[PDB]
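Quick one: co-fold with manganese (II) ion.
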Amino acid sequence: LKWPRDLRPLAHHDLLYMGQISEEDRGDFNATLRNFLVPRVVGSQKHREVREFIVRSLKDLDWDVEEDCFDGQTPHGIKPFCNVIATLNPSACHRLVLACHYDSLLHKEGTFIGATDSAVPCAQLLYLARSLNGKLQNQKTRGDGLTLQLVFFDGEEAFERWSSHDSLYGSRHLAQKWHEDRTSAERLESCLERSEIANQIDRMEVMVLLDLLGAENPRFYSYFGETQPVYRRLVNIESRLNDAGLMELPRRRRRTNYFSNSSTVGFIEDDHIPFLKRSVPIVHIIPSPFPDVWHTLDDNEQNLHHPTISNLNKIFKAFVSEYLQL
Ligand SMILES: [Mn+2]
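Sure, here it is.
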């Protein structure tokens, strides 16, 4: 069964534009990332500050911003959690959803920054919203029934040993909340003809979850047969950026090969799981293997690889432009 939305190849002109990274682009992304490169454990003041920063940044871009806040039991007692959901056009029936988690692991060995996990993804979502704002605000006025939505999940990380009850607090809560929130096509702007909408979860057209990004030379694979058509667009976009000579490589005539043109057999627990269980199509943009620094005290700012981050930002901008026809 084919993808419900016909995926129009990005024109060469738009590919080139989305693949440009000005020096002020680098500066803007880095200034954004600075805000996330702090310990932000659930319950903490810096966590509150990060949450408010995400909210303010997106309200400042005229997005609808909602918080899904709740208290939940953990192995460390009751904890406050707040998912941040930003929607460009709330009334649009369908959402291309981009997501990540904004809490950082409470590491028993010491202060843990979680630069890849997931400060970089957080900054990338905000950067996309900011760099594309003009084109997104224009796309919003089309009445075409599609919009962009950014979800910054809280409480992805376990407090103690990972378990089904100790992990994914924010994503489990939100998936449940949206599944139970009933709606229908007649309440929404321009749903696709063959759509089945019974609740808010049905409006998530696909969730692209970014996690553990920022380390050198990540390897991605298609984890889900259901989103192979979408995944293949990332593969194709990356290839064309390389053809166009727009990727940053250590030497001339190398190509990036982040998005493997294959699927892998692997089960990764992450914020997509509660949505996957409710039939939300998932593209999981997480490296395999995980970065070497994963859950170590070395997951920090200096171990990020800036050229890779720039290349990923090009791919993501082109992908959003292609999906939303910006
Ligand atoms: Mn982690």
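If it helps, Residues 1-326 form one domain.
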